[PDB]
Write a protein that binds this ligand. Sequence first.
Ligand SMILES: Cc1ncc(COP(=O)(O)O)c(CN[C@@H](CS)C(=O)O)c1O
Lengths: 385, 388
Amino acid sequence: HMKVYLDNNATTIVDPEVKAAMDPYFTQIYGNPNSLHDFGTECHPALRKAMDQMYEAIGARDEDDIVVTSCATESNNWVLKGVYFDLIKNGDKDHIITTEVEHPSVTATCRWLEEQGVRVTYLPVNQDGVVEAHTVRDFITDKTALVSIMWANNETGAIFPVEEISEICKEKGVLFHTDGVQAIGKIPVDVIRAGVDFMSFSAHKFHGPKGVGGLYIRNGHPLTSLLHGGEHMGGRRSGTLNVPGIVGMGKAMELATYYLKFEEEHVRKLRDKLEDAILEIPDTYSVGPRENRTPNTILVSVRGVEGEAMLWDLNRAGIAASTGSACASEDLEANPIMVAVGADSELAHTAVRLSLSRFTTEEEIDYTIEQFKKAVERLRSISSS
Amino acid sequence: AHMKVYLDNNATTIVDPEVKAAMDPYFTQIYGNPNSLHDFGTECHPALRKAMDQMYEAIGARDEDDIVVTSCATESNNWVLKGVYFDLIKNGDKDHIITTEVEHPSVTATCRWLEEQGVRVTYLPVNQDGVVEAHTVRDFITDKTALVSIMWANNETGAIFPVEEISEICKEKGVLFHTDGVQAIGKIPVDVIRAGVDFMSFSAHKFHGPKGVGGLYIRNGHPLTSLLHGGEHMGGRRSGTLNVPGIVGMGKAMELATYYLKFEEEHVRKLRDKLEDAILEIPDTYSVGPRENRTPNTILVSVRGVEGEAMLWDLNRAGIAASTGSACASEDLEANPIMVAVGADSELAHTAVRLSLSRFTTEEEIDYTIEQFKKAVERLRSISSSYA
Ligand SMILES: Cc1ncc(COP(=O)(O)O)c(CN[C@@H](CS)C(=O)O)c1O
C-alpha cells in the first residue's frame, strides 16, 4: 500500500524550490511594496524578477500587461464582467460565445450574464473533445462582444486550436479570451503566437502556491476593473500584493517552462505507460485523442463500473484521481466510443480522470496499474452487468 | 539606517512566526484540493474548520452568521458595494449610499464608480474628533438609502468610529450597515453582534497574517450577489480554489490577535504614549485626533516648519519606517490651534507623519525613534527661511 497522487489537473504540489523562493516574504521581508520606506521597497527587486519570469514564461511583450489576481476564477470573472460592462451595458453589443466544457468560473459567470440579458451560445464539443474555429466563425454576429474558449480542457486534457480561433476573431474584429490554466507547464504557451487578447492562468496548477493567479491582457487593452481602489497593478486591480504568491508564481512559471523544455517526455512516457496498461483491460476507453492531449491526462471510461465507485476503490487503495463527464457515441469504423460532453447533459456517464505531474514516479505508475486492474476486476465481479 | 525600526504597522504587519509555522505544511506536505473527494484533498479539512472556527470566535460571530474568505479586504469592499448595488439598486427601489470622506480607496473609488453608474453617494465629512457621528447618518438616510458603509477605525488617525450607535440608527431605518474593520482586529475589541453591523471587511496582513487573504462577515448569511461566480466555494458565495495556507494563517493570526489584545491595550499603548508625549515636547507639534478615542498603536503628528514627505524620507535615512496622514488646521473650543483630520482630496490638507506600533515594538525602538524624530525636525527647521 502506497499513497499516489494522480489528481494534478485539480491542484499541484508546490515545488520545494518555489516554497524556498517564497519563504523570506512572510517574516523577514514583510513591508508593503506601496510604502516609500526601505522596509517596503526591500521586496521590489523580487517583484520585478517575478513579473519578468511570468512575461518570459508566456511570451508576452513589453507593451502587454500581466495583472496578478487571486485565482483564475477572479481572472475569468474579471474578463467576462468587464467586457460585459464596457461593450454590452455601455455599448452596442449583447453576445458572448463560449463552450459547454468551460470551468464553472466561466460557465456560471456566463449564466449570470445571461440573467442580465446577454445572449450567450455555449458551443458544443466535437468527437475530439474540442470546439473548431469554423463553428466560432459561423456563430459570430455583428453584436458579439467577446469569444471565450478555454486553451485546454481540465477533464480530458484536449488542446484547443487557439491560434485558428484567434485568426477568425481578428478577421471579425472581436476580442478573444482563453482560460489557459491547463496550458501552463503542459504545452508551449506563446500569447502572441496564439493571438489571444486575454488569458487566464492559476499558479497552483503548475506547482505554485494556492491563492494567486493572473490575467494576461494584450497591449494593455481597456478592461474595467473588477476590484477598484488603489493604484496596484497599474491601476487595474486594487488590493495589497500577495508578495509570497507573486514570487512563488514567477519561480513556478520559470520552472514549468524549464521542465516543459527538457522533461516533457518523462511525464509523457509515464502517462502513455499508464494509459496503455489500463487499456489492456477489456472494454476500457480513453476519452480524447492522445496526439491532441496534454501529456499528463487520461480520462478512462470503464464498462459496467461507475466512475465514482472506481474513485472510491482507488482512494481506499491510496490513489487519488478525479471525475470527468463523458457520453457514449459511435465512431465511423470502430463504433463504440466515449466522447467529451457537458456535465449538464443527460447523456453523461462518469469516467475516471488520472493526471500526472513532473513529480510522478514510475513506481507510482506500476502500483497504479496493478491496483487499477485489481479494482476493475473487483467492481465488475460485483457489477449489475 | 543606524537602527532599523518598523512603525508602519497600520500599512502592513510582520507575519507572526507561529502563523507562518501553522501555514508551512499546506504548501508541499498537504497540497490536495479541499474540494476533492480523495484523501489527499480531505486531509486539510480539519485545519480549515479550525481556522474558520478561530475566525468566528475572534470577531464574536454566531453560527447563523457567514464569514466568507476573500483575497483581501479590497475584494470584500468591492463585493459589498457592487453587490448591494446589484441587489437593491439595479434590481430594487433604492439609489443612495452613505459613507465617509476618509475611507480606504477600495471603498472610495468603488463608490465613485457606482456614482458613474447613477448611484447617489454622500461622502460624509469628518468632525474635529476625526469621526462621523450617528445623528448625521440619521439625517442623511432617506427611504432610498440602500447601504451605509463607514470604517470601524481610521487607518491614518486611528480614530474609532461609533459603529454601535450608527448600527442602532440604521436598524431604526431598516438600512444595511457595513464597516471596513481592517484597522480594528487586534487593536480594539471586535464583537460584530454588539456592533450590530451587517457586513465587516478585514484583512489578515494587518494583524500579523499573510498577505493575499481577507474575509467578509455577513450577519445572517444575508443575500449578497457574488463578486466571484463559479464553483460552490464558501457556500457558493465566493468561488475559486481555497487559499488553504492563507486561511490557516488567518485563523491562527486572528486568535493570536484576540489573545494579544490586552498586551496591546496596556504595553503597546504605554509605548505609543511615551513616543507621542516625547514628540509633543517639540514646539509647534500637533497630534491629530483625541487619544482617548484612538487605537493604542497609532500617532498622526503634524510638524509646523517641516514638510511631511521630507520628514518621512529623513526618518527612513535613519532607518525608521513611517507613513503619511492628511490633516487640516482648526481651533478647539478654547480657540487654541489644533490639527484635525481631513480627506486627502481636500486642498486644505497638508501632510502629517503617521507612526503605527505593533505588539513587537520594543522600548529601544521608541527611544531611538524619539531621538531621530527630534533630530530631523531640528535639521529641517534649521534650513528654513520662513519658520518662526
Ligand atoms: C482601512 C483599510 N481597509 C482596507 C485596506 C486594504 O486592505 P487589502 O487586504 O490590501 O485589500 C487597508 C490597507 N491600506 C493600507 C495600505 S493600502 C494603509 O496604508 O493604511 C486599510 O487600512
